[PDB]
Amino acid sequence: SFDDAVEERVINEEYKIWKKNTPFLYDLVMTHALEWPSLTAQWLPDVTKQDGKDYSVHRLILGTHTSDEQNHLLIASVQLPSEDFGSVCGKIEIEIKINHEGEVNRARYMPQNACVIATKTPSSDVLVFDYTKHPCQPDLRLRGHQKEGYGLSWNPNLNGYLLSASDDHTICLWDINATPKEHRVIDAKNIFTGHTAVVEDVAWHLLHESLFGSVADDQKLMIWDTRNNNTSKPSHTVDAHTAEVNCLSFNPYSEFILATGSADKTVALWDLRNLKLKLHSFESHKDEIFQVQWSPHNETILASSGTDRRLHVWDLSKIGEEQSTEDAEDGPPELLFIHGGHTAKISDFSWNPNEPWIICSVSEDNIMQVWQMAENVYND
């Protein structure tokens, strides 16, 4: 296809430019190439150090994608710089591994116990593993629904309470510490219907154990309160976007601020104190936005990625301040950085919780990048 070739040519040509600019825009850039593409990515909490070594070791929960051969749940170790056969190892290796029935849409560990890893299967089953019970048959199977799904979310204030979004217009909620299991299976403590179409994502409120937000193709954002009796009455419903909403994420330093990403090429800034008013809209992306993560370190900056192969980093503070037309190009003032090291759609990304500004993004070309934008791009 002509349009394909043209695209490809632009992709490759810009990527050359990128590489050449690398030393100016970044302080760290690693580009590993997994055996199989990953659809998920999340940094584990822990960090491992050794006296003497000029690096610390961090880890990522990755996944494999092959509708052909065997799939796996992966744990990758990564060597990151410090303040400053039998041969030394590559900076990136795969420590743990676990055969997985079908690609891994998402893989997220449980806050209260990082050994517990929840999984989203291309099936209808939501799997749970303990990467210790496997030094593969999952330690838990979660009934709940019929269609496949990506949305997945552990409750920080309620050990075990996990939520999942699905293509069957519903949201399940199981307690992993579920009384009994009747054959490694937990049915579903609740199922939230109230949603016109496919639910794209789900997210527990960070501080209020009985709250969470859903987002779906029915272009709406719904806030829920498990304490309610009707599993159809969402505490609130917001006409968040024009197109389908693919994701939502709560700000780590707030109890009211939210953020959603839609196919409408937009990221909406929401405040629970008044879901009637959309605080602001981040524009610049040129395609669907499936990911939106806040920096675990700075309350004012968040990131977004999608089909345009670009990862955008925005700084709320700069929302407003006037800018010169010849500068007001490239994008709005809230736009702080654009990462264009990826050559395909970015399937997922994660902020390193321990090393401010280190981020890990995964692409469909099975490429994995661990980068960190130049300090002068955000300092001074």
Binding site: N21, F24, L25, R310, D327, D330, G331, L335, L336, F337, I338, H339, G340, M373, A374, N376, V377, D380
Partner: peptide, 11 residues
């Protein structure tokens, strides 16, 4: 060199 911020803006 605040053109790095500008450079970062392009993409």
């Amino acid at each position: 060199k605040p053109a790095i911020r500008r450079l970062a803006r392009r993409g």
